[PDB]
Design a protein around this ligand. Sequence first.
Ligand code: HEM
Ligand SMILES: OC[C@H]1O[C@@](CO)(O[C@H]2O[C@H](CO)[C@@H](O)[C@H](O)[C@H]2O)[C@@H](O)[C@@H]1O
Length: 154
Amino acid sequence: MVLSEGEWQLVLHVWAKVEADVAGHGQDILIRLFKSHPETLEKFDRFKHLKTEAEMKASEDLKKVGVTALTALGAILKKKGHHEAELKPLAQSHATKHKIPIKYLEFISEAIIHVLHSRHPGNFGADAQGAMNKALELFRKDIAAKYKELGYQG
Ligand code: HEM
Ligand SMILES: OC[C@H]1O[C@@](CO)(O[C@H]2O[C@H](CO)[C@@H](O)[C@H](O)[C@H]2O)[C@@H](O)[C@@H]1O
């Protein structure tokens, strides 16, 4: 699968708005993930004990983890599909150390889409959401292939 340049521009135009406040977007996305799919919180040994949305919002550790994830994803998106180098360390850590199944990458992709739809209706209409879905599907397809090369079914 290959995105067109027009599709990449829709992706990068909404990402530019995320970048006004990466920390706040990361909080919203992780909280949505943990509320919609509580099993995913168990993978974060550093804050898996958090019990409520209020505790999640107050956690500086959770905020920093959200910034780190969205910054890595932004760098991938800006490569417009030419992301082989960026996926290597990420696939290795997520397959081998953190043990994150592809299904959980689907869950975080849904959380990203949900939050962008809520926060950015001016830059996240139907065509823009479809382009972002196609970019996240490409990311997950390529990471899944790397997982398999690395010895993890995912
Ligand atoms: C867009 C998808 C994601 C991106 C770009 C991403 C990126 C990152 C980065 C850059 C790190 C730090 C370096 C590393 O260890 O590789 C990290 C750490 C981590 N990631 Fe992800 N991640 C993603 C999705 C997920 C998901 C869905 C989970 C769990 C359900 C997860 C679990 C973890 C854990 C447990 C750590 C260690 C966190 C800590 O230091 O406390 N990641 N991730
Ligand atoms: O590059 C591997 C890995 O490191 C992270 C932080 O966990 O990003 C760091 O390295 C990038 C490439 O050199 C820099 O652009 C970035 O500023 C730096 O923090 C992850 O994003 C990435 O997967």
